[PDB]
Structure 1
């Protein structure tokens, strides 16, 4: 006996489940009617496997602003819930979407806390926003007497009174007035050029976490000692066609030795086989080195 002989794998087929169903979150980004900053929009979406590489390469998004979370690893991550929003921010107030600020609507309307991941992305809006004349229906906060906190809602459906004058249907000199309108100037600078922005928040909490990301799928190979990475199962072997009849819900295949030997195709629902690829021992045959110097090899 001299040594052993083994065959190495070549391919790494990684077949996964068939297809992601849908996620209408893009529709949330791409509608036609939206409110103002006064509406602290909070749209909770779960149990949805959503595509994230689209946002990295889109039509007119550009201003991709994520906080201290790595951009690439989040596409193949799985969370529990996401949140959305949409309003007008009037150009330069893009600076206000920061982890901690209080100069302006950074705290007045749509308050965002520090250490909040919440990837935020805006875009230019010259036709929907900055319309002719000015759609003064949109409103931004006057003074925010609500005195918000991180992750809070400012809903002030009333008016101020300083110390003396009630303003219950009476023109009060110190009672101020509700939120001022929105100056959609036709064509002006960033100070009068509104922008539409959307934020995608994440939270794990403690849940089954059925909000995952898309996964790839390479073509299969047969009659070749290859590395297979089916759902959960990772191994090496030769995959061929079998004739065993599986139940309509079973997926795995075992034997008396409790070793996996049959895998159901997650795509086409076909029953395969698993077999180690030709391991053995090598031995030589010699007639004695004194007589001659020829050998034969037995595999």
Structure 2
């Protein structure tokens, strides 16, 4: 059967980047041409592989990680990047093998009074390891003084809201990101490109 890429890309709503969604793909046939040869994507960058060679390949799993960030932050969904997203929300490894896909979603994620449904982590004691996910809401203790779950002078809540409006500048507009990663393990390779 055909791979459920429509469900991830054309999903009605996306996850907050701090709680980025992960969909496992398995036992299907994926036509990646419907993606690369499409003109809906402002970013389509692949790292471990060539995109036009992806139709001749077979993997054991394919992972599609999706979330929303501002345009100026798409830059950080790349190997060896740093900043508030890469450090504390979504980390891609140096040895990344897969593709990063992004489009401007203003039409669907900015709303008149402002859309505040997409959140991000601003503070963390240390940087995320690659593909790690942190969804805790513990009070960030910036100083020596303990917080005891109480916000104050050097005690900060770690999650903050994006606010998307239709009239923001391009750099601050919402962007949907799908990160496809590939892996070939000692096991049956069930996700294959379309066979002749």
Structure 1 CA distance, aligned partners of 2:136 and 2:151? 19
Q: What's the TM-score once normalised by structure 2's chain length?
A: 0.90
Structure 2 CA distance, aligned partners of 1:56 and 1:148? 30
SS at match of 2:21: coil
Q: Does 1:164 align with 2:145?
A: yes
Correspondent of 2:81 among 86, 101, 108: 101
- Alpha-carbon shift at residue 57 of structure 1 (Å): 2.1
Determine the structure 1 residue equivalent to 2:123: 143
Cα shift readout 1:256-277 (whole Å, capped 9, x = no counterpart): xxxxxxxxxxxxxxxxxxxxxx
Structure showing greater relative contact order (alpha-carbon pairs closer than 8 Å, 6 or more residues apart): 2
Conserved? CA contact 1:80–1:207, under 8 Å? yes
Unaligned runs of 5+ in 1: 1-20, 217-299
- Alpha-carbon shift at residue 83 of structure 1 (Å): 0.7
Q: Does 1:122 align with 2:102?
A: yes
Structure 2 CA distance, aligned partners of 1:55 and 1:86? 15
SS at match of 1:106: helix
- Alpha-carbon shift at residue 196 of structure 1 (Å): 0.7
Cα shift readout 1:151-198 (whole Å, capped 9, x = no counterpart): 322222211223214243x45322112311111133121232111110
Determine the structure 2 residue equivalent to 1:86: 66
Structure 2 CA distance, aligned partners of 1:187 and 1:159? 33
Q: Does 1:75 align with 2:58?
A: no
The structure with the larger Rg is: 1
Conserved? CA contact 1:36–1:139, under 8 Å? yes
- RMSD over aligned CA atoms reads 1.8
User: For the structure 1 residues 59 and 98, does the alpha-carbon distance in structure 2 shift closer, same or farther, using more than 3 Å as the test?
Assistant: closer
- Alpha-carbon shift at residue 126 of structure 1 (Å): 1.9
Greater strand percent: which structure?
A: 2
Task: Tell me which stretches of 4 or more aligned residues in structure 1 moved more than 3 Å.
Answer: none
Unaligned runs of 5+ in 2: none
Structure 2 CA distance, aligned partners of 1:146 and 1:43? 26
Conserved? CA contact 1:146–1:154, under 8 Å? no
